[PDB]
C-alpha cells in the first residue's frame, strides 16, 4: 500500500460561522501583576520596518526585515464591576454594579437602561458589593468595558465586553476595580512594549467553497477533468459501514471563523498617531492613507506579523497564555526605518 496523512485537521470542526462578530476569550493566564489582562481595538493596515534583532537565535545583532500590523486603540470606558461565586459545577455570577452617567450611544447596544439611578444609589450598591467581598463567598472579580468608536469617526454603536484581573487575591482586585470604575483606560497603562501577545479575532469570509480549497484535496486526473469530476473527490466511503462518516471531506462554509494566534510581539505603542523614534517624531499613516481605512488619529499598536480578520474589524489581545522558555526582552527594539510610502 501507499500511506499519506489525511487531508485537513479535525480540530477546528464543526467549521461553521461564528456565533458572534465580537470574539470570545475562554481562558485567562496566570499573572501576578494586578492589572487588566487585555485590551481591544480596530485593525487598520500593514507595513514593514527594519530593526536590529533582539530575539535569540542566529540573525541576532543584524538588520532584518519585519512585517507589521497596526491596530488602532482608543481608550476604553470602565462601567461595571461583576462578582463570581462557586456553584455545584462551576462559577456563577453573584452581583453587578454599573456606573450612572453613561454615554448616549450605549443604548444603541443596550436599549433598556435604568431610569432614576443617581450617584446615591450607585455608592450604596458599591458599598454592598464591598461588604460582600469582605465576607468570603467570592471567587474572582472582573471588569465590564465598552469601546468608544465616536472618537475616530468609525461608528457609533459600541462593543461591550468583560475582562479579568491579575492576582491570586480578590481584595486587591476590588481595590483596583473600585479605583478604575467610571473612567477611561489607555493602552499604555496596561500593555508593555516588548510583551508577547495572543491575538483573538474572527477571520475573513470566503463563502461556500469546495473540498479542493477547503480541505486540500488533490485535483483528479485529466481524464476525470474531461469526465466532469475533477474538483470532486472520489469516494464517500466503503460499503460497510453503510453510512457516510463525518471525516469525509465535503463542501461548505469557508471563512468567518473564530480564531486565536499565539506569540505575536508588541513592538511599539504610540500616542496621537505619531511614533517618536529616539531622534524625531514621525507619523505612521502613509501617503494617501490606508486602503479601505482612513487616517489614524488616537492611539495605535505595532504587532509583529499577521493577525486574523479584515481591516475595520474588532480585535482582542491578551498577554501570552502559552509562551516559550526563551523569551525576547521587554523593551522597544532598535528601529532604523519605517515605511510611509503608498500601500495601495
Amino acid at each position: 500500500k501507499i500511506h499519506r496523512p489525511r487531508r485537513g485537521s479535525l480540530a477546528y470542526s464543526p467549521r461553521k460561522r461564528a456565533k458572534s462578530i465580537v470574539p470570545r476569550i475562554r481562558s485567562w493566564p496566570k499573572d501576578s501583576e494586578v492589572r487588566m489582562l487585555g485590551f481591544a481595538g480596530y485593525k487598520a493596515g500593514m507595513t514593514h520596518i527594519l530593526m536590529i534583532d533582539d530575539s535569540p537565535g542566529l540573525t541576532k545583532g543584524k538588520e532584518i526585515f519585519v512585517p507589521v500590523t497596526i491596530v488602532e486603540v482608543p481608550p476604553l470606558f470602565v462601567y461595571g464591576i461583576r462578582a463570581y461565586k462557586q456553584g455545584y459545577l462551576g462559577l456563577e455570577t453573584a452581583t453587578e454594579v454599573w456606573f450612572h452617567d453613561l454615554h448616549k450611544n450605549v443604548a444603541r447596544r443596550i436599549k433598556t437602561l435604568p431610569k432614576n439611578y443617581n450617584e446615591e444609589a450607585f455608592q450604596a450598591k458599591l458599598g454592598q458589593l464591598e461588604d460582600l467581598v469582605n465576607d468570603g463567598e467570592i471567587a474572582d472579580v472582573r471588569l465590564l468595558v465598552h469601546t468608544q468608536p465616536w472618537l475616530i469617526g468609525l461608528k457609533k454603536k459600541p462593543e461591550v465586553m468583560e475582562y479579568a484581573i491579575g492576582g491570586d487575591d480578590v481584595k486587591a482586585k476590588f481595590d483596583y476595580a473600585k479605583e478604575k470604575i467610571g473612567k477611561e483606560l489607555r493602552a499604555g497603562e496596561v500593555l508593555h512594549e516588548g510583551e508577547l501577545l495572543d491575538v483573538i479575532a474572527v477571520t475573513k469570509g470566503k463563502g461556500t467553497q469546495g473540498p479542493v480549497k477547503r480541505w486540500g484535496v488533490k485535483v483528479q486526473f485529466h481524464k476525470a477533468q474531461r469526465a466532469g469530476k475533477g474538483r470532486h473527490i472520489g469516494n464517500l466511503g466503503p460499503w460497510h459501514p453503510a453510512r457516510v462518516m463525518w471525516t469525509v471531506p465535503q463542501a461548505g462554509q469557508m471563512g468567518f471563523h473564530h480564531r486565536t494566534e499565539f506569540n505575536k510581539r508588541l513592538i511599539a505603542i504610540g500616542e496621537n498617531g505619531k511614533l517618536v523614534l529616539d531622534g524625531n517624531e514621525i507619523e505612521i499613516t502613509p501617503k494617501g492613507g490606508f486602503p479601505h481605512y482612513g487616517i489614524v488619529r488616537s492611539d495605535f499598536l505595532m504587532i509583529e506579523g499577521t493577525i486574523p480578520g479584515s481591516f475595520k474589524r474588532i480585535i482582542r489581545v491578551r498577554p501570552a497564555i502559552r509562551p516559550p522558555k526563551k523569551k525576547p526582552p521587554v523593551e522597544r527594539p532598535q528601529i532604523t526605518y519605517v515605511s510611509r510610502e503608498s500601500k495601495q
Binding site: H48, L50, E63, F65, T336, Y337, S339, E341
Partner: protein, 62 residues
C-alpha cells in the same frame, strides 16, 4: 537602511523592495519594479521616455 537607485529610470527606492540582477561576469543591476525590469530585458530605450532621467541626460546632448 540604504536607498538604492534603479538602473532603468534612475530613481531612489526604499529598503525592503526591488530586485538585484547579477550577470555571470559579476556586473550588477538594481530594479525598483517589475516594469523597469521587463522593459530592460525587452529592449526598450529609457532615453526617449519623459518619466526617466536618461531623458534629461539626453535633452542635454541635443
Amino acid at each position: 537602511a540604504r536607498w538604492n537607485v534603479c538602473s532603468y529610470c534612475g530613481r531612489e527606492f526604499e529598503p525592503g523592495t526591488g530586485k538585484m540582477f547579477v550577470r555571470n561576469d559579476g556586473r550588477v543591476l538594481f530594479f525598483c519594479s517589475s516594469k523597469c525590469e521587463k522593459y530592460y530585458f525587452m529592449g526598450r530605450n529609457p532615453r526617449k521616455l519623459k518619466w526617466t532621467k536618461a531623458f534629461q541626460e539626453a535633452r542635454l546632448q541635443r
